């Protein structure tokens, strides 16, 4: 699953080849700056350790040496700038080409990349993947070569000056390189590892949030919160172990640096004392070979990121190569010009590309001339829509062929074909565009004249006059701000402006009003003579005007002929017609007040590890002083031994203190985030649904808070004290020890350390992640891609993919340009600051030559002042960059504390209310009005009234959303109204309890939703916080014929169900949810869409679960088909807020109305 290296860089032109070769050479010369620097320093230390002894010409020697340092500094300035910029420009150009090209191929792909290859996963295989290639072939390969250079240069210097010590520093070099390698991997991408412990828990957190209303209604907070807590403690353990490992890694790196110092000096003093070497010879060889041996470990993540790069480029390239058999960028199909409209279907079969096992269609044969209109009648899902698709060559037959105007479409161009044809599907959708462009979608040259013409044609001119911004109003997403009438009218007008020739409609009058349906149909009919038409409708009003009427059985057209044809047959359509006629906050330390022993030991170890650097400065300056002074061999030997031993002990203390600081601050951080997520969640399940509706308060925002808050607050409590105290020990001691050893040089060199400190921070970001990678700009380009991606098959027949392809490019142009400039900007700052380090050895040491020449200090005094402020500012930067940001984290903690302290209007945990002793089961509604807090302008119900009694099985039926979802949340208290009055047995639910109400009665939702638990769990979940009996389950589970399918499946009551209902179908689940509240044994029965997805022979055993238990309960059944409603006691049909009817059934039948039709769909 990897693509070769030669076939990796294929989207690079001549300019990109010059950007890669020069960046590589520039990086090969910038990596030889450190080793060469150690060649000059070890040479300047032999000067400073031979003068003053015999101050003559000492100043002159230092000026010549200063030139060398400024030369290396300038070389590194130029080479760094080139390397970083050129490599970031070669990867910035290629990746852009690949984005455009990948997206160009994704659009022009044969239908069948949504059933076979999931689509969201395609967004993760696009955006993310593209970013992974970018990080792969980008700047990293620069970094690699540089480090490689520092290897070879290193050892070459090591072997040229003196080799007896290079073989020794090399004998241990595997371990040095291995520690460096391990540390390099833990340094890079150390912020992209926080979703491993919150991955398994993320699911449980998302699942409870997905159905908050069901948990509140059924009581089941407790067990959900408990599952959560368990997930938590697991993630906590993993986090602690990772913190321990990170700090052990850095500790071992420092232990090995220091023990290698110890060995180098213990042996190099034997060499020096035997006259063989000098001290410059030892400092050069040792420093250079050590730098080489670590900079070969710095080069491990480059190979790791390259392997990832090609491992993803494989799959991308295999998409881009995939040329579909049927497409529109082949341009080979003939373009016909004599169009008359000749639909010819002869033996057309089909098996779903999604599922080949079932052929829902078994052969058809029909012929339709121009102007000939045919209606099509059948059940919803008889292959009507899919056949209207297959008309436009959205698919191809499995046996046979479809032809038009004599010849078949299997050889001619499709673009002209899929253009000249208009098709309004079952549900036409519209995107985030303008109504001018909404209509203009068909083709290009559609003028405002044509726009106004179409809005006249489809009666779509009214909302122009009544709603302002008459031609530039931004319709909602998927057509939201509009209504069904506006949607359907702009749909028919748009389908008219494309200059159609064959017009195919699917359920053309689902939601259209009385006048609206008629005007839609007539506007369509005035265009039925110069253009063929085939219609599908369920209202038989939009069928009569067809020339022929067809009958769908197994997707086949078996009944054919005009009206009188089937009206003498007395068939199916006959039966149809005969039945019809804020503020910041600083108290966050009072969140983590309880874990103080941890912070005490943490501050202590921070102090020790921050003071270890001046200790090294002193020891190093003194161990060179050992060789400048005039002593004997024996005193030099003993002081060299003691100082080597102090180096070793410093290394060991460094290791221990690092592991300890890591342990303790990591454990305090994990305890904090654990407790914090627990409390956030707990306080989350107390807010009403009138808090949980808002789409500015979405599940995705909540999941980000749960994890993100954890991260942020853990940062802005523990890491802040870690960092401040390390840095204070470090630079406080460095500056204060320097000021008293020479103030002249410290005053100068303390006007540099801002830039050395800043230089360390910018480098650190460059070393691990921190490549800016702005995605907010990318999100806008991505959002356009997501739209087309959601309905690629539906849009392709519109042919608008061009006008979306370009909607990609013209958008990607903003950030690309910007990103280009940035790969220059960063390339200088980095470079500049690196240069500054190489310049310090020229300034300080030059000034040093002055002072040592006027006996205002000593050599080892300059070494101690320099080593303790320059290296100190380096350490200050590298430390202050290895910790989370502050202001971000402070804002996160601000919001978390904002929500923690919350107090809901109505508490679900609070016991308040009415806890009566008796009840009969009566409900009454009066002048009750109900409104959202987010949607006040659109009303649903308009102050209705009801009267429901005990055992009385209420009957209610409506269309798709006239207010039947309304009444549910009014009885199980998700909603609060501002008007009306409700009397449950004369006892208002606005006074009565809200949890005591819930242990008393139990309802069923539209659909069953379920757990990652056992089947026994969800069915027993229906009642909690009380001793549940295994037999009560086998009571209702058998009572509903649902245990029958439980005892057969292995682990009958012990099979861990799939997620949310993937391991079974609906008919299996529609039992267990009614059976869920069956075990509740309430005093009020409520169902809603209980025959939604269930077998007509199981709707008996599921409705019999009612009848023998209807007793005592205020039974309110609501279904779609009247099969179960006709046995319900009292029928209350609704229409848009006003109570359409209420009373005995024959009150609804002798006076015939909208119900007289609602039972007239398919009666027998």
């Amino acid at each position, epitope marked *: 699953p990897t693509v070769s290296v030669f076939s990796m860089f294929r989207y690079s032109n001549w300019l990109d080849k010059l950007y890669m070769v020069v960046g590589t050479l520039a990086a090969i010369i910038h990596g030889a700056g450190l080793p060469l620097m150690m060649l000059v320093f070890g040479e300047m230390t032999d000067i400073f350790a031979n003068a*003053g*002894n015999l101050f003559m010409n000492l100043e002159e020697d230092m000026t010549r040496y200063a030139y060398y340092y400024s030369g290396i500094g300038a070389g590194v300035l130029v080479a760094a700038y080139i390397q970083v910029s050129f490599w970031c420009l070669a990867a910035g150009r290629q990746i852009h080409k690949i984005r455009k090209q990948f997206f160009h191929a994704i659009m022009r792909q044969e239908i069948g990349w949504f059933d076979v290859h999931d689509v969201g996963e395609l967004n993760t295989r696009l955006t993310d993947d593209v970013s992974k290639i970018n990080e792969g072939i980008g700047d990293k390969i620069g970094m690699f070569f540089q480090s490689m250079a520092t290897f070879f240069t290193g050892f070459i210097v090591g072997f040229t000056r003196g080799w007896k010590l290079t073989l020794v520093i090399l004998a241990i070099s595997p371990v040095l390189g291995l520690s460096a390698a391990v540390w390099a991997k833990i340094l890079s991408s150390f912020t992209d590892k926080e979703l491993l412990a919150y991955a398994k828990a993320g699911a449980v957190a998302e699942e409870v949030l997905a159905a908050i209303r069901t948990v509140i209604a059924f009581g089941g907070q407790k067990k959900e919160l408990e599952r959560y807590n368990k997930n938590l403690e697991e993630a906590k353990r993993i986090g602690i172990k990772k913190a321990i490992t990170a700090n052990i890694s850095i500790g071992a790196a420092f232990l090995l640096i220091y023990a290698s110092y110890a060995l180098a000096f213990w042996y190099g003093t*034997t060499l020096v*004392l*035997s*006259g063989e070497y000098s001290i410059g010879q030892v400092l050069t060889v040792f420093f250079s070979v050590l730098i080489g041996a670590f900079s070969v470990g710095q080069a491990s993540p480059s190979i790791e990121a390259f392997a990832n790069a090609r491992g993803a480029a494989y799959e991308i390239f295999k998409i881009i190569d995939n040329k579909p058999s049927i497409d529109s960028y082949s341009k080979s199909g003939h373009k016909p010009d004599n169009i008359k409209g000749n639909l010819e279907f002869r033996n057309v079969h089909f098996s779903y590309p999604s599922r080949k096992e079932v052929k829902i269609l078994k052969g058809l044969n029909l012929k339709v001339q121009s102007g000939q209109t045919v209606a099509l009648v059948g059940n919803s899902g008889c292959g009507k829509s899919t056949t209207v698709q297959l008309m436009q060559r959205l698919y191809d037959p499995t046996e046979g062929m479809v032809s038009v105007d004599g010849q078949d479409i299997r050889t001619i161009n499709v673009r002209f074909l899929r253009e000249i044809i208009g098709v309004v599907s079952q549900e036409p959708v519209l995107f985030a565009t303008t109504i001018a462009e909404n209509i203009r979608y068909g083709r290009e040259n559609v003028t405002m004249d044509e726009i106004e013409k179409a809005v006249k044609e489809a009666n779509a001119y009214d909302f122009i006059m009544k709603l302002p911004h008459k031609f530039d109003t931004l319709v909602g997403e998927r057509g939201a701000q509009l209504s069904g009438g506006q949607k359907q009218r702009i749909a028919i007008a748009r389908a008219l402006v494309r200059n159609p020739k064959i017009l195919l409609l699917d359920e053309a009058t689902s939601a259209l009003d009385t006048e609206s349906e008629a005007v839609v149909q007539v506007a369509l009919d005035k265009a039925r003579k110069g253009r063929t038409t085939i219609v599908i409708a369920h209202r038989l009003s939009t069928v009569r005007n067809a020339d022929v009427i067809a009958g769908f059985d197994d997707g086949v057209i078996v009944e054919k002929g005009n009206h009188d044809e089937l009206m003498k047959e007395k068939g199916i359509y006959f039966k149809l017609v005969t039945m019809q006629t804020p503020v910041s906050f600083w108290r966050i330390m009072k969140l983590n007040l309880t874990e103080w022993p941890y912070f005490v030991v943490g501050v202590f170890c921070a102090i020790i590890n921050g003071g270890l650097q001046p200790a090294f400065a002193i020891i190093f300056s003194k161990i060179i002083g050992v060789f400048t*002074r*005039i*002593d*004997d*061999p*024996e*005193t030099k030997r*003993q*002081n060299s031994n003691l100082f080597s031993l102090l180096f070793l002990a410093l290394g060991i203390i460094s290791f221990i203190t690092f592991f300890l600081q890591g342990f303790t601050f990591g454990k305090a951080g994990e305890i904090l985030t654990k407790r914090l997520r627990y409390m956030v969640f707990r306080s989350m399940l107390r807010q009403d649904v009138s808090w949980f509706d808002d789409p500015k308060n979405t599940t995705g925002a909540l999941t980000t808070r749960l994890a993100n808050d954890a991260a942020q607050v853990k940062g802005a409590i523990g890491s802040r004290l870690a960092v401040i105290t390390q840095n204070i020990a470090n630079l406080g001691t460095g500056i204060i020890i320097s000021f008293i050893y020479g103030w002249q040089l410290t005053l100068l060199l303390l006007a540099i350390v801002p830039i050395i400190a800043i230089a360390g921070v910018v480098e650190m970001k460059m070393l691990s992640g921190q490549a800016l990678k702005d995605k907010k700009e990318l999100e806008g380009a991505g959002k356009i891609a997501t739209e087309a991606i959601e309905n690629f098959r539906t849009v392709v027949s519109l042919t608008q993919e061009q006008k979306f392809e370009h909607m990609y490019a013209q958008s990607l142009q903003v950030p690309y340009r910007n990103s280009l400039r940035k790969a220059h900007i960063f390339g200088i700052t980095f470079s500049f600051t690196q240069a500054m380090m190489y310049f310090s050895y020229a300034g300080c040491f030059r000034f040093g030559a002055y002072l040592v020449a006027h*006996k205002l200090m000593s050599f080892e005094d300059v070494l101690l002042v320099f080593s303790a402020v320059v290296f100190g500012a380096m350490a200050v930067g590298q430390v202050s960059s290895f910790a989370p940001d502050y202001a971000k984290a402070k804002i996160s903690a601000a919001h978390i504390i904002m929500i923690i302290e919350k107090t809901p209007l109505i508490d679900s945990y609070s016991t308040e209310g009415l806890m009566p002793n008796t009840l009969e089961g009566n409900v009454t509604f009066g002048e009750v009005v109900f409104n959202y807090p987010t949607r006040p302008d659109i009303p649903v119900l308009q102050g209705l009234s009801l009267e429901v009694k005990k055992g009385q099985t209420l009957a209610l039926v409506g269309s798709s959303g006239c207010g039947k979802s309304t009444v549910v949340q009014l009885l199980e208290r998700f909603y609060d109204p501002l008007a009306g009055k409700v009397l449950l047995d004369g006892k208002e639910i606005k006074r009565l309890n809200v949890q005591w109400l819930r242990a008393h009665l139990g309802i069923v939702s539209q659909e069953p939703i379920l757990f990652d638990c056992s089947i026994a769990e969800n069915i027993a979940y229906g009642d909690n916080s009380r001793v549940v009996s295994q037999e009560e389950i086998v009571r209702a589970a058998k009572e509903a014929n649902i245990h029958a399918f439980i005892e057969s499946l292995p682990n009958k009551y012990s099979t861990k169900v799939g997620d949310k209902g993937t391991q079974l179908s609906g008919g299996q689940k529609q039992r267990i949810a009614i059976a869920r509240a069956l075990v509740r044994q309430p005093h009020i029965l409520l169902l809603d869409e209980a025959t939604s997805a269930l077998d007509t022979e199981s709707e008996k055993v599921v409705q019999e679960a009612l009848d023998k238990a209807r007793e005592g309960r205020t039974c309110i059944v609501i279904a779609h088909r009247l099969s179960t409603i006709q046995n319900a006691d009292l029928i209350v049909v609704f229409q848009n807020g006003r109570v359409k009817e209420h009373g005995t059934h024959q009150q609804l039948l002798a006076q015939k109305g909208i119900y007289f039709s609602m039972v007239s769909v398919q009666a027998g």
Partner: antibody
Amino acid sequence: EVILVESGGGLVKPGGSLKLSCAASGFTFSSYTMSWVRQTPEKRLEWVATISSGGGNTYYPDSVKGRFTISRDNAKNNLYLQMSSLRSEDTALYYCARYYRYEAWFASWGQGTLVTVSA
Amino acid sequence: DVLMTQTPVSLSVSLGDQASISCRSSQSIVHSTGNTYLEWYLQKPGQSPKLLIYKISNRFSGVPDRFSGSGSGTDFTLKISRVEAEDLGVYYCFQASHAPRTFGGGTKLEIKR
């Protein structure tokens, strides 16, 4: 040049206590190992003590250890030898001595300070 | 310890002649580093001794070219050519290889008159 001048010697009663000093001018006194050497009245030299260039290390032979104590003061450029419980065999002339880079042990001496020890 | 002897005692050298002064150690003088320290010191009547040649074969800055010193192991010798009256005193062969540093007896140089 390098001018060392010592002082502090005279007649002492056995078991007594005395303190010789050696003041040095003309170089960077805070950088050189310094030794004390002694010449007995048979005219046969003998090493007596050494001190490194910062005061840390110090070396005595195996017949003086415990009694003598040599120390230095870099601020005034002084080198002291405090002798306690003197014997009858410690009657001799006492030279300062500097140490020379390239590892020669007594580069630049001083003049004696005779220290007679008797009753 | 290590005791350094010096076999000649009374030298009767004449102006223009040569002189050979031995120093025959007892243990073998070789430091851990591998260097061999053995310096020669001169004392002219009534003065502090002055350093002559350090290590084994070297000359302090400010000495004549007639002074030679060669040898190996425990045997070391000093030679003086063309003896000039400015060269008359007692010669000590210091050695610093082992933790008690020990001078030598001393040789008297009596120029013939």
